[PDB]
């Protein structure tokens, strides 16, 4: 099945600037933004749609990886879609989790990040709370964790 829900966040950072870092500078930021994430390596492609990347991370005593795919990039509308693909770093009941993000200008000039998350399951029961939280968390590296690191960084203050 497919479990779809919406998430919204804010940033003090102007949307074009935030968007640019999300789509151009992820590889450099993410291992600095997330203590557990050791490295990101691009496996196939150049940063546009179809690109596959491997995140190497430590969770408990175990070195694991997830694969990330860039689904869509539309700079004119500040749209960035991506997914984490079925396996080592997702719960067993989950084939894929996609994040569909759009950045929009807040009234006061910061950003509102509008996200639709789609969790694809093997079965006919929506994921239990933890397995969905764990899957969502894998996707945070690519959006929320970057906005967080940037908001505390000298260049975006
Ligand atoms: Na790290």
From Swiss-Prot:
Binding, Ca(2+): 31, 34, 37
Sorted UniProt keywords: Allergen, Calcium, Cytoplasm, Hydrolase, Metal-binding, Nuclease, Pathogenesis-related protein, Plant defense
Alphabetical list of Pfam families matching this protein: Bet_v_1 (PF00407)
Gene Ontology cellular component list: cytosol; nucleus
CDD domains per UniProt: Bet_v1-like
UniProt-annotated binding residues for trans-zeatin 1: 7, 82
Binding site for trans-zeatin 2: 59
Matching InterPro entries: Bet_v_I/MLP, Bet_v_I_allergen, Plant_def-hormone_signal, START-like_dom_sf
Annotated binding of trans-zeatin 3, by residue: 68, 80
GO terms, biological process: abscisic acid-activated signaling pathway; defense response
EC numbers, comma separated: 3.1.27.-
SUPFAM superfamilies in alphabetical order: Bet v1-like
Gene Ontology MF: a single term: signaling receptor activity
Compartments, as annotated in UniProt: Cytoplasm, Cytosol
Known role: Class II ribonuclease (RNase). Binds to cytokinins. Interacts with melatonin.
Protein name: Class 10 plant pathogenesis-related protein 2A
């Amino acid at each position: 099945g497919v479990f779809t829900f919406e998430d919204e966040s804010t940033s003090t950072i102007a949307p074009a600037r935030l968007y640019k870092a999300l789509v151009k500078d992820a590889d450099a930021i993410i291992p600095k933004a997330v203590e557990a994430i050791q490295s990101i390596e691009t496996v196939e492609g150049n940063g546009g749609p179809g690109t596959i990347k491997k995140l190497t991370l430590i969770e408990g005593g175990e070195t694991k990886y997830v694969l990330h795919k860039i689904e869509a990039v539309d700079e004119a509308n500040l749209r960035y879609n991506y997914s984490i693909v079925g396996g080592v770093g997702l719960p067993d009941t989950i084939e894929k989790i996609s994040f569909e993000t759009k950045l929009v200008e807040g009234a006061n000039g910061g950003s509102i990040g509008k996200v639709t998350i789609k969790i694809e399951t093997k079965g006919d029961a929506q994921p239990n709370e933890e397995e969905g939280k764990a899957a969502k968390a894998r996707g945070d590296a690519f959006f929320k964790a970057i906005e967080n690191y940037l908001s505390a960084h000298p260049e975006y203050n």
